[PDB]
Amino acid sequence: QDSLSFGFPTFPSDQKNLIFQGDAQIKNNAVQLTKTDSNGNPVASTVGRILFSAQVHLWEKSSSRVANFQSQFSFSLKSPLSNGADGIAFFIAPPDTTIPSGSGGGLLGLFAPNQVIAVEFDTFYAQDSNTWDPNYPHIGIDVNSIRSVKTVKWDRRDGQSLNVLVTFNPSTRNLDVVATYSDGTRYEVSYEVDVRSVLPEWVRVGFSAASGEQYQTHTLESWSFTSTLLYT
Amino acid sequence: QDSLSFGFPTFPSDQKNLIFQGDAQIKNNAVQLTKTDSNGNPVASTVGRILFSAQVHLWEKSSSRVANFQSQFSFSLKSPLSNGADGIAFFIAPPDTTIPSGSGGGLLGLFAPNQVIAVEFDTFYWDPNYPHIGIDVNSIRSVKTVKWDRRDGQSLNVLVTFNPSTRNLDVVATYSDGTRYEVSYEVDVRSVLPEWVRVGFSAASGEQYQTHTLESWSFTSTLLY
Numbered sequence: 001q002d003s004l005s006f007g008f009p010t011f012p013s014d015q016k017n018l019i020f021q022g023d024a025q026i027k028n029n030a031v032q033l034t035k036t037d038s039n040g041n042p043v044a045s046t047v048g049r050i051l052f053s054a055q056v057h058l059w060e061k062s063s064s065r066v067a068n069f070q071s072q073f074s075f076s077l078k079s080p081l082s083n084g085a086d087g088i089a090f091f092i093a094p095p096d097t098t099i100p101s102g103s104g105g106g107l108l109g110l111f112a113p114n115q116v117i118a119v120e121f122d123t124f125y126a127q128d129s130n131t132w133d134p135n136y137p138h139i140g141i142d143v144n145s146i147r148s149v150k151t152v153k154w155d156r157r158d159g160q161s162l163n164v165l166v167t168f169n170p171s172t173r174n175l176d177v178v179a180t181y182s183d184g185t186r187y188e189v190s191y192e193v194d195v196r197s198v199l200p201e202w203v204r205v206g207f208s209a210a211s212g213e214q215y216q217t218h219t220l221e222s223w224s225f226t227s228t229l230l231y232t
Numbered sequence: 233q234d235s236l237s238f239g240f241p242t243f244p245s246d247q248k249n250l251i252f253q254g255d256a257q258i259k260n261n262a263v264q265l266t267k268t269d270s271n272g273n274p275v276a277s278t279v280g281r282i283l284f285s286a287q288v289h290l291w292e293k294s295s296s297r298v299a300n301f302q303s304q305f306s307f308s309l310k311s312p313l314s315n316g317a318d319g320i321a322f323f324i325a326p327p328d329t330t331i332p333s334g335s336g337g338g339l340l341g342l343f344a345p346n347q348v349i350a351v352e353f354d355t356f357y358w359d360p361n362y363p364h365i366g367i368d369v370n371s372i373r374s375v376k377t378v379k380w381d382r383r384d385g386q387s388l389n390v391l392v393t394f395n396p397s398t399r400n401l402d403v404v405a406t407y408s409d410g411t412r413y414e415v416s417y418e419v420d421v422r423s424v425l426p427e428w429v430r431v432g433f434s435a436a437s438g439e440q441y442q443t444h445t446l447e448s449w450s451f452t453s454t455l456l457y
């Protein structure tokens with residue numbers, strides 16, 4: 001399909017178009033990328049992802065067209081542990097992408113010590129962070145192996161939902177990420193990326209989270225996505 | 233997804249979201265629901281269907297909601313025969329539906345000699361004369377039809393639409409010259425189809441054939457109150 005759109009104002013249990021991976025599953029009409037005990041609280045050493053069944057025709061060489069697309073979602077994070085971890089992330093990878101062996105923890109079930117595009121919302125520590133301020137969370141644009149090729153200071157607000165909007169326009173190869181809270185608190189970051197130089201014409205779009213030594217929930221509450229091939 | 237929506241201006245060779253069943257394949261950036269030869273000509277004994285991977289939530293007994301969708305598409309039909317048969321038909325069956333056994337001939341690969349709705353364009357021998365566009369709700373094939381005109385090689389733009397607000401399923405098939413055909417049968421979809429369904433097409437030809445070419449297809453569905 002040149003064009004594809006789908007939305008989940010909410011995440012009821014009887015899902016069908018979502019490829020749950022890892023501890024991923026539905027509870028309380030939402031998606032827990034990270035595992036969560038019986039009482040709802042997050043556990044440790046948990047990782048999970050979910051993709052949308054239908055693949056998105058990212059781009060097409062035969063017609064020199066790239067997909068102009070938008071991704072709107074919302075996630076709230078919760079955890080007793082004073083400093084939740086590690087983070088959630090919207091990614092775009094090849095269709096057959098599966099959780100990389102040992103990609104848990106600060107890798108967010110995405111990478112392992114690929115070919116991907118991602119907009120991760122980290123909250124873990126890095127005693128060497130070279131593209132952010134470690135002693136403070138961050139939103140990072142991950143292109144291929146290069147993690148956070150551009151970041152923006154963020155804030156982890158326990159239990160509070162964060163409405164985000166990932167929009168990529170091929171007419172500029174401009175990927176914008178606008179995340180905001182309930183009280184107008186606004187966090188953003190843009191970055192020129194040529195989706196073609198890093199992903200196959202056909203990909204899969206979805207989310208990933210993870211927790212290692214420490215934890216937090218990564219409740220995916222709503223989502224919407226649209227992509228359309230544009231000449232050029 | 234409470235709302236699903238997709239569009240294929242055309243059908244290239246690299247389709248990742250179509251469940252090809254039977255002999256349906258892609259050729260000339262279109263879907264050859266029925267099979268053709270190396271010369272691209274229709275043949276005998278054959279049925280073919282396609283489905284859109286992503287299931288469509290047609291209604292929700294929970295929120296008691298019903299999906300308000302819409303499906304447009306175009307096809308043409310070629311055969312060296314003057315009485316080419318049997319036809320192509322848009323449908324909505326459960327996610328597991330797969331070409332029924334011995335469903336060749338006029339069964340369009342949609343009926344065995346289920347739960348499914350379908351807008352069929354029968355060209356074969358519902359006025360047992362002129363072709364007809366029929367609405368097949370579940371097992372009752374064609375509970376409402378309208379004479380139709382087969383025009384070899386001519387595209388037929390079709391707009392099947394369902395509205396939970398009146399449960400009216402409307403079909404509007406028109407040609408280049410403007411000739412328009414329409415039909416619309418009341419249908420409490422909840423009555424025959426599970427909440428989760430798949431959409432797609434089907435066609436076939438037994439002893440009389442033709443080419444069932446799906447050239448494009450747009451679909452959108454959104455649950456409502």
Ligand SMILES: OC[C@H]1O[C@@H](O[C@@H]2[C@H](O)[C@@H](O)O[C@H](CO[C@H]3O[C@H](CO)[C@@H](O)[C@H](O)[C@@H]3O)[C@H]2O)[C@@H](O)[C@@H](O)[C@@H]1O
Nearest residue numbers: 315316317318336337338339356357437438439440441
């Ligand atoms: O339409 C005029 C022509 O009709 C021809 O009749 C065919 C024969 O009686 C015999 O072969 O049976 C077929 C129908 O059976 C199969 O084909 C139809 C159509 O493809 C299909 O619906 C059915 O399920 C089955 O597969 C007749 O069409 C023949 O009499 C010609 O001489 C005549 O001009």
